[PDB]
Design a protein around this ligand. Sequence first.
Ligand code: CF1
Ligand code: MG
Length: 452
Amino acid sequence: QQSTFLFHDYETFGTHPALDRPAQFAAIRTDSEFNVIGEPEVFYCKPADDYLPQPGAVLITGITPQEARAKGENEAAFAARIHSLFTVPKTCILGYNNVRFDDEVTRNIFYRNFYDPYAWSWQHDNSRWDLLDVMRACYALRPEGINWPENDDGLPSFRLEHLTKANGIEHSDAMADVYATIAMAKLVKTRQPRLFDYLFTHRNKHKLMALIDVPQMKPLVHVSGMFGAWRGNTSWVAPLAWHPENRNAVIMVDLAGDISPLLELDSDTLRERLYNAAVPVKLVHINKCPVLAQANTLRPEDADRLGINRQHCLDNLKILRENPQVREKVVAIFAESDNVDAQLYNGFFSDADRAAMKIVLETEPRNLPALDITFVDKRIEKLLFNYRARNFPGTLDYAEQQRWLEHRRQVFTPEFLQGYADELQMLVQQYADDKEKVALLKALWQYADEIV
Ligand SMILES: COc1ccc(Nc2cc(C(F)(F)F)ccc2Cl)c(C(=O)O)c1
Ligand SMILES: [Mg+2]
């Protein structure tokens, strides 16, 4: 079996990866050298009748709820198709902003439809990557040979459409974003070969672990969206401690920051603060392909370009090393909704509960009503009801139908429905000169009228 890349992208009906619903999934498989070896995989997800899309999302995607409903399969089948692609052995699953967005959509789709939300990304030698932080790393660390567009605010832009246009890459077609992401990968591989190889290799958590030296507070360069485009998303950081609960999270200090709150304030004040002096502390999640490298990877000329003050960072590093009591202080900081759709991270399920959920998954939907099985975790009863009612409404008995009707009633409150009508009317005035958007908004009104 050969190593492959699976490039993918979602179009969704809103910004919330848990509370909004997916509309469309697109993917294609390449070999290890980015040669396309698969057929385009494009399919839609039917939205259940307890949901209205965010109008803004539909204006961006151009996909109406009517179209996803008419072309889609139920979310159970949508999940099955995605799971089948993602679990082919030796697959690197990647996209553009997938770590923060698409992967969270995936986890939630799997969660709602009785798949393991996590196993897909690591089992059978699988992995994840994300070209967004690769582009950011290039801009900060090795900008030579790539054109770096500025947005309307005068800051470097990493929007996929800006980067393609700025570098002469054809960008238009449900597959447009996927092909654009492949082109980004080829771009960096060709123009910054050693950085590309370094970043690919260091997608693996164990390679990242080797860079981390807590006793020595060994400084690293870290490229992260959280740092801000104004400094090329980059700083020098040092590891203080590992997270008390989260096995994959290390606690970093931003050496370019103001460490005085860490020196002066107690752990209780600092916990309230990061939830007035800024607390220069962040978590780095080693399972989320963070960009980390030895400190000298950021060259002086580039530190100067990004406005990063080396002496300030060195002074802070010296102070922190002479005050190891700050380690316990940050550990103490991190020592620390009734909608089941929002409860993915309310904990892991027991081995027994997962085994039972696996039976739900592998049982014929028609045999679910009579399915004898036991759950402990309180989420599962509601997950199972929603699953059946949304995907297989023809299998509900009268009491279950009445339960679903009440559920819908509690979503479509008086405040929600008025707000929705108000937003559509506002948007049709705002975008009156845009004929495509006007037509989409009329479609949204018509869908809302039906789904009520
Ligand atoms: C013994 O502790 C140190 C101290 C400084 C180091 N390097 C370094 C440190 C910084 C810092 F300013 F961020 F601290 C910037 C750039 C570099 Cl190359 C390094 C290092 O690069 O390994 C180790
Ligand atoms: Mg996307």
